[PDB]
From a paper:
The ring-like structural maintenance of chromosomes (SMC) complex MukBEF folds the genome of Escherichia coli and related bacteria into large loops, presumably by active DNA loop extrusion. MukBEF activity within the replication terminus macrodomain is suppressed by the sequence-specific unloader MatP. MukBEF is the SMC complex of E. coli and other enterobacteria. Its SMC subunit is MukB, which associates with the kleisin MukF (Woo et al., 2009; Zawadzka et al., 2018).
We then reconstituted a complex of MukBEQEF dimers, MatP, and an 80-bp DNA oligonucleotide containing matS close to one end in the presence of ATP and magnesium ions. In addition to dimers in the apo state, dimers associated with MatP and DNA were readily resolved. Because we positioned the matS site close to one end of the 80-bp DNA used for sample preparation, two dimers were able to associate with four DNAs in a “tetrad” arrangement. Different classes of tetrads allowed us to assess the distance between the two dimers. We observed dimers distantly bridged by the DNA molecules and closely apposed. Since the DNAs are roughly aligned with the dimer symmetry axis, it is conceivable that DNA translocation may operate along this axis. The architecture of the MukBEF dimer permits binding of two double-locked loops, whereby the loop axes are parallel and monomers are arranged side by side.
Numbering used by the authors:
A (entry chain E1): 2 to 213
B (entry chain I1): 1 to 134
C (entry chain B1): 248 to 297
D (entry chain H1): 2 to 73
E (entry chain B1): 1138 to 1235
F (entry chain J1): 1 to 135
G (entry chain F1): 9 to 80
The structure:
């Protein structure tokens, strides 16, 4: 009959969109924030009405995607109604390093709580110090001023990732943080045991990762 | 064309048939998404008392696979409606036990006649046998 | 967690037992009447031939 | 046709695959049909072609090839 | 059941259907299959519905360790898990009291 | 009693009959007030998955008119359901033209037997002629 | 539940683009005939929908619509 919700929208989708949690979750998602198991309320909300939200967001030409690790996010399409952006290469370095720390048992004593200094030390341990520094400044040759510049850049990238939900600052401390499973996306190029050059094409075709 | 078709009657027939099918759960509309199907069904429901627009509704949202069934249902409805006026043109429906029906249908298929023609011929032969004996 | 797992176990148990009860009964019935009808039919066939 | 109606009957009265039922496929050993199963198979073969068979000549049939040979 | 006669089989099937009606009201397609299974001209429908029930419980498995997709097999693993959770609950309530 | 009465089946039949009658627009309820009738119908709807309570809903709100039609329809449905098992007990529905049916019914009422019996006698006379032709 | 007319407005195929442009701060005037008419028709519900975001859907005296963010 008329004046009846099923005329325009499914009942469960309307119930989900009328829930008190919908607006904060939608604003965060459109901002690019990933959702992990830690946000128990938001994660459960996404799980319960997961299908309604993928079909709703499809209207924006963006896929609400749940990675096998269990974290939801948004991937815009080439025809996205919501703009799209790509992380910096330094952001990739810090995200890969963050995934390593999530999987690294040596730092188990930290119990998941990490400081930016430890992250930088691990980064320099695994990466090429000076050749990575080259991107921070084209004229760097190990100068300690440029060293501090790279430290500051790493801190800034860490803050941006915090904005993306890959990392949480502690309820009182902004100098310490706890990693989230979302960081696993930084390894999507290696989660499959195949040739790297074919997986990169598969991902870029899927829209997962553009090149630089 | 033997029976003249009347729009304000056949359109009411079609509306009643579609409402019955919808109430029975049949998917009236071609829209898989539930919202569009419900909207079209509501349009139909509020469309009562209208031939010239129920026809258009059928043309625009009707399920492709139900066209033949609706057409033949309306054919049968028209024929029955016109035949129900006179006694001799009406049809009497009965139930026959399966063996009797099997034998009768065997005879009808064998002789190429219909059930009515086969039974008429058989009764005439029975009467003729009575007269032969009598 | 305990409540959810207990509910799941109870539901599984009840569904499985009731479905088996519902189906196997009629299955065994149909089998028994099939055997009986075959036994009945053989004698008719034998008499008919002669 | 008769030569495939026989397979239709045998497969749907014994439940064996159409591929399994070849001309030389014996019922008891290949198709597995036992006493009552073979009885029902012959009854169904009788029903399909609306004919009748003698008891001895029917029991003589114990293979797909023999089945068709008596049917055709 | 082979010994009994048709009447008892029919009665117990009716009782099982009565239990199912309660046990199935939540589901829509499974309930519809149960309803369709009632036609006496097509006994095979019954079996189909049975399959659906399995085809249902297969998807209700929670995580990988309970993926003994045979539903009758998952019961033992689930009972093991309930017993385990009982011990953890005892420990946890002791901890909360302290 | 020739046909076994099954409670959980006849109850479902009765519930379906009530719902069908209501959706056809008939007043299954015994209430003339709109509100009580609507409430009773709503309760009946809730009773979908509990056929056992349907007997009680009948005893509380079923229209007094419907006892005869109810007891007729469920009886006929039971007979048909139990006869449908075997072909030889089934019934076949056929339609006859008015002249043909008139003659057949007159003949049957003359012989004092049912239509199937009259057809049996008729087809048997025809088959007797065929048999004596064959011999 | 949800208001019915609000569901109608959100479901309308124009809603995604208009919503993106509003959340981007764009002002919808009389020039955008379809969008302006849609907002005119469904303002009573979009005001509540965007107040759920602690934002105000304002129709200026000139007529154009826009979103004003609150402190929250
Ligand atoms: P299977 O080992 O159960 O054997 C079944 C049967 C071959 C004994 C049976 O089908 C059968 O032929 N019974 C009647 C045997 C007979 O020739 N009787 C004379 C006419 S009643």
């Amino acid at each position: 009959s008329s004046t009846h919700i099923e005329q325009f929208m499914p009942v469960k989708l309307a119930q989900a969109l009328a829930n008190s949690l919908f607006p904060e979750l939608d604003s965060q998602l459109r901002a690019g924030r990933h959702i992990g198991i830690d946000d128990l309320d938001n994660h459960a909300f996404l799980m319960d009405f997961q299908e309604q939200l993928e079909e709703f967001y499809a209207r924006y030409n963006v896929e609400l995607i749940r990675a096998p690790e269990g974290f939801f996010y948004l991937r815009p399409r080439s025809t996205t109604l919501i703009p799209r952006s790509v992380l910096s290469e330094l952001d990739m370095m810090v995200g890969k390093i963050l995934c390593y720390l999530y999987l690294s048992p040596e730092r188990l004593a930290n119990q998941g709580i990490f400081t930016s200094q430890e992250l930088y030390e691990e980064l320099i341990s695994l990466a090429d110090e000076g050749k990575l520094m080259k991107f921070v400044n084209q004229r760097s040759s190990g100068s300690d001023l440029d060293k501090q510049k790279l430290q500051e850049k790493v801190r800034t990238t860490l803050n941006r990732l915090r904005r993306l939900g890959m990392v949480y600052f502690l309820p009182n401390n902004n100098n310490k943080f706890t990693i989230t499973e979302a960081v696993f996306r930084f390894g999507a190029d290696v989660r499959s045991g195949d040739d790297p050059r074919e997986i990169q094409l598969r991902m870029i075709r899927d829209g997962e990762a553009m090149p630089v | 064309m033997k029976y003249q078709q009347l729009e304000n009657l056949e359109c009411g027939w079609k509306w009643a048939y579609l409402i019955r099918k919808h109430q029975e759960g049949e998917p009236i509309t071609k829209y898989i998404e539930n919202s569009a199907a419900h909207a079209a069904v509501d349009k139909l429901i509020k469309l009562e008392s209208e031939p010239v627009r129920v026809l258009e509704w059928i043309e625009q949202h009707m399920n492709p696979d139900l066209f033949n069934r609706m057409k033949q249902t309306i054919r049968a409805r028209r024929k029955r409606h016109f035949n129900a006026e006179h006694q001799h043109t009406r049809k009497k429906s009965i139930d026959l036990d399966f063996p009797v029906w099997h034998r009768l249908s065997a005879l009808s298929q064998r002789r190429g006649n219909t059930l009515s023609e086969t039974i008429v011929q058989l009764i005439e032969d029975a009467e003729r046998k009575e007269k032969y004996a009598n | 967690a305990i409540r959810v797992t207990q509910s799941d176990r109870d539901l599984f148990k009840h569904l499985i037992t009731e479905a088996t009860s519902y189906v196997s009964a009629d299955y065994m019935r149909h089998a028994n009447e099939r055997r009986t009808h075959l036994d009945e039919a053989l004698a008719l066939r034998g008499e008919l031939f002669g | 046709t008769i030569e495939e109606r026989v397979k239709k009957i045998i497969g749907e009265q014994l439940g064996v695959k159409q591929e399994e039922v070849t001309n030389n496929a014996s019922f008891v050993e290949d198709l597995g049909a036992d006493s009552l199963d073979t009885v029902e198979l012959v009854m169904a073969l009788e029903e399909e072609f609306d004919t009748e068979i003698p008891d001895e000549e029917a029991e003589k049939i114990t293979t797909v090839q023999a089945a068709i040979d008596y049917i055709n | 059941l082979a010994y009994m006669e048709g009447g008892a089989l029919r009665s117990m099937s009716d009782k099982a259907l009565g239990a199912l009606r309660l046990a199935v009201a939540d589901n829509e397609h499974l309930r519809d299959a149960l309803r369709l299974s009632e036609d006496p001209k097509r006994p095979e429908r019954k079996v189909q519905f049975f399959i659906a029930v399995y085809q249902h419980l297969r998807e209700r498995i929670r995580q990988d360790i309970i993926r003994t997709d045979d539903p009758v097999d998952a019961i033992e693993q689930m009972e093991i898990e309930l017993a385990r959770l009982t011990e953890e609950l005892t420990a946890r309530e002791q901890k909360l009291a302290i």
